[PDB]
Design a protein around this ligand. Sequence first.
Ligand SMILES: OC[C@H]1O[C@@H](O[C@H]2[C@H](O)[C@@H](O)[C@H](O[C@H]3[C@H](O)[C@@H](O)[C@H](O[C@H]4[C@H](O)[C@@H](O)[C@H](O)O[C@@H]4CO)O[C@@H]3CO)O[C@@H]2CO)[C@H](O)[C@@H](O)[C@@H]1O
Ligand SMILES: *[C@@H]1O[C@H](CO)[C@@H](O)[C@H](O)[C@H]1NC(C)=O
Length: 302
Amino acid sequence: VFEWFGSNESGAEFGTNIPGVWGTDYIFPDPSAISTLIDKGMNFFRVQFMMERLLPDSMTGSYDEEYLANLTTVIKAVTDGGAHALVDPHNYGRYNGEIISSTSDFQTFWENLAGQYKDNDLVMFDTNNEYHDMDQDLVLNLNQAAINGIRAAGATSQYIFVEGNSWTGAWTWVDVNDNMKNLTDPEDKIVYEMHQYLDSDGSGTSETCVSETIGKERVTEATQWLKDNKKVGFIGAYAGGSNDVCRSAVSGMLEYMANNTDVWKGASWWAAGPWWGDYIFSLEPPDGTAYTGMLDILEAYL
Ligand SMILES: OC[C@H]1O[C@@H](O[C@H]2[C@H](O)[C@@H](O)[C@H](O[C@H]3[C@H](O)[C@@H](O)[C@H](O[C@H]4[C@H](O)[C@@H](O)[C@H](O)O[C@@H]4CO)O[C@@H]3CO)O[C@@H]2CO)[C@H](O)[C@@H](O)[C@@H]1O
Ligand SMILES: *[C@@H]1O[C@H](CO)[C@@H](O)[C@H](O)[C@H]1NC(C)=O
């Protein structure tokens, strides 16, 4: 049904201590859990990392090469298995607590990072996770700078996932992100990535979904925005509690998207990863709540 369909793999961005230490503060996704999701039919994994850990001096400085290697190990595990890996600096438009306002340093950051993966045609690049509370022109230029840096590295074959303001929410998209339609790419492989949760405030922090139909309701206008501006999109992060109302909401959002695959290239569940424990949305096999409680709904699209 969709071009791409799978899961986020979180953990490398975990914890409050920055840089912090592996095994205590954060961890990398587990290739064998990723293999199990691939065996279920998922062809897409969006792998979270923290910029401050990849780059402990400055945005344009030296890598922590052990952290980079680890990120690369997960990417090779995804791509070796034939799936696309979407590389997600999980940073909210910010670096070291401050809004990234230097388009130039951002462009440089993305040219270096894309340089690491330019030859892996199964890799995809997400410009940044959930920009918010920042100037809308800056968000536009930040995304263009990423595109420009990526292609300047010679990463010319890979799709580039761009995110908007208001936490790239689908439900607020037309209200704030209209200028994002002006992004250009010499290769023409821009995907508009939006997120959508189904609890009352859209924060994705409660199991309760507002209603059976709230998912469809929250992506309708964005769907129409994509059509009217002749772009394609993707739901990079979405979830609902393992309960009957949420199951219908999730089910119904995916069904509506499946009726509009001219614009929706697919979706990724928030989230899998080895340290979610009893997280309400965990899709980590063998016993994540979403893994046992929701996966059947997602398999209709696999
Ligand atoms: O650090 C070691 C310690 O970690 C505990 O695991 C914690 C993590 O420390 C913490 O980083 C992690 O934070 C999650 C948070 O719970 C989610 O609500 C949030 O999900 C957001 C997401 O970040 C947005 O971008 C997305 O789109 O919206 C979602 C939905 O709100 O994601 C962050 C991860 O980025 O939470 C873990 C708690 O479960 C371990 O439990 C502990 O044992 C370890 O010692
Ligand atoms: C990289 O992974 C290894 C485990 O394979 C670990 O010992 C190391 O601490 C990891 N991350 C970093 C930043 O070193």
